[PDB]
Amino acid sequence: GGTHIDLLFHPPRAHLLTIKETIRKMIKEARKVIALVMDIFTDVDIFKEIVEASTRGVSVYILLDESNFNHFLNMTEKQGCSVQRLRNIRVRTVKGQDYFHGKMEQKFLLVDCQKVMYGSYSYMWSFEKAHLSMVQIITGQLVESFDEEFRTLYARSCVPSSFA
Amino acid sequence: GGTHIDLLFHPPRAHLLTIKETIRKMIKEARKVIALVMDIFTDVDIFKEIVEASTRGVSVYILLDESNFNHFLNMTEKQGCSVQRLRNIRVRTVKGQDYFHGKMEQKFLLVDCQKVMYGSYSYMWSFEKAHLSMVQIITGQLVESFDEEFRTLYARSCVPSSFA
Numbered sequence: 001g002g003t004h005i006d007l008l009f010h011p012p013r014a015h016l017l018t019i020k021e022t023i024r025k026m027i028k029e030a031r032k033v034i035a036l037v038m039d040i041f042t043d044v045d046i047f048k049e050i051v052e053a054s055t056r057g058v059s060v061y062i063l064l065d066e067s068n069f070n071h072f073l074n075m076t077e078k079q080g081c082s083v084q085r086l087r088n089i090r091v092r093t094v095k096g097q098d099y100f101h102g103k104m105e106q107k108f109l110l111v112d113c114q115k116v117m118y119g120s121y122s123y124m125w126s127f128e129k130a131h132l133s134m135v136q137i138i139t140g141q142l143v144e145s146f147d148e149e150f151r152t153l154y155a156r157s158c159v160p161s162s163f164a
Numbered sequence: 165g166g167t168h169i170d171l172l173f174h175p176p177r178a179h180l181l182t183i184k185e186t187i188r189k190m191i192k193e194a195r196k197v198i199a200l201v202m203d204i205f206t207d208v209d210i211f212k213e214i215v216e217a218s219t220r221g222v223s224v225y226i227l228l229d230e231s232n233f234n235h236f237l238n239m240t241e242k243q244g245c246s247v248q249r250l251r252n253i254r255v256r257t258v259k260g261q262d263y264f265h266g267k268m269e270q271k272f273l274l275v276d277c278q279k280v281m282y283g284s285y286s287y288m289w290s291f292e293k294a295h296l297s298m299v300q301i302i303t304g305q306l307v308e309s310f311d312e313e314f315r316t317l318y319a320r321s322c323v324p325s326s327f328a
């Protein structure tokens with residue numbers, strides 16, 4: 001078993017779906033587990049897809065950069081969909097070394113220990129509308145290294161200050 | 165011919181060199197061409213390695229996000245090493261769609277059409293000291309898709325406003 005990689009771009013180049021559509025498709029097709037690591041998460045469409053996955057029974061684990069976590073909290077509040085009262089969703093924060101806030105500069109989506117989207121696309125309106133970005137769709141052997149990185153980050157994450 | 169990928173982390177996990185050391189090694193070993201795409205470039209050690217490569221005869225092509233290009237210009241000025249008077253270095257800027265500045269959110273180093281470093285590490289002090297990040301070292305088939313992306317970005321780049 002090797003590794004297979006396809007590239008996707010925003011704007012699209014030689015593929016039928018946008019990166020956002022592919023994100024939503026990956027989440028819709030999740031059967032078991034979603035493991036998300038994200039610097040900034042304010043995209044309501046992606047959030048809805050994840051909430052809906054969790055209501056299907058999919059376990060969702062989200063790790064967010066601590067310094068931008070308030071933007072995600074703001075968005076969940078706006079949607080009237082507190083992540084604290086969703087039984088299948090765990091959210092924790094990760095930070096780097098301070099001096100000036102050190103950050104978790106990492107973005108990937110890992111679905112059912114089977115498929116990874118890894119790249120520069122952040123889950124924000126600006127990446128759908130404004131920014132140029134790229135991602136890899138990864139399957140095969142290298143997916144295991146993403147699982148191991150997710151676990152490592154998860155081990156160094158904190159319960160967000162808000163949550164009691 | 166397939167594709168081979170190794171992961172490197174900052175801080176390091178199960179490898180001997182830091183990402184910055186690996187960047188400097190890749191640049192030192194460049195024989196022909198360096199193609200760099202970078203959101204923010206203020207790291208003086210990496211800049212010196214690139215200037216030195218260019219004095220060796222290596223062709224250097226750098227594409228920077230337009231909105232942060234001033235930070236690179238500031239750094240080159242501080243170092244007394246204007247990129248305009250270096251014959252083997254071309255620098256152009258890339259932007260996304262405005263509304264609020266659209267950005268080129270892309271980071272990769274492509275050396276001698278042979279090896280790529282692709283990941284979340286930006287060429288800034290903060291990524292050496294403060295941030296958590298990861299990259300892939302890519303060789304083989306997938307390198308060709310990076311060459312093609314570099315050319316595509318290069319085709320949509322502009323001469324920076326400063327340069328006459």
Ligand SMILES: Cn1cccc(O)c1=S
Pocket residue numbers: 105106107118119120121269270271282283284
């Ligand atoms: C997070 N990430 C991953 C790969 C490439 C990137 O530029 C970034 S920001």
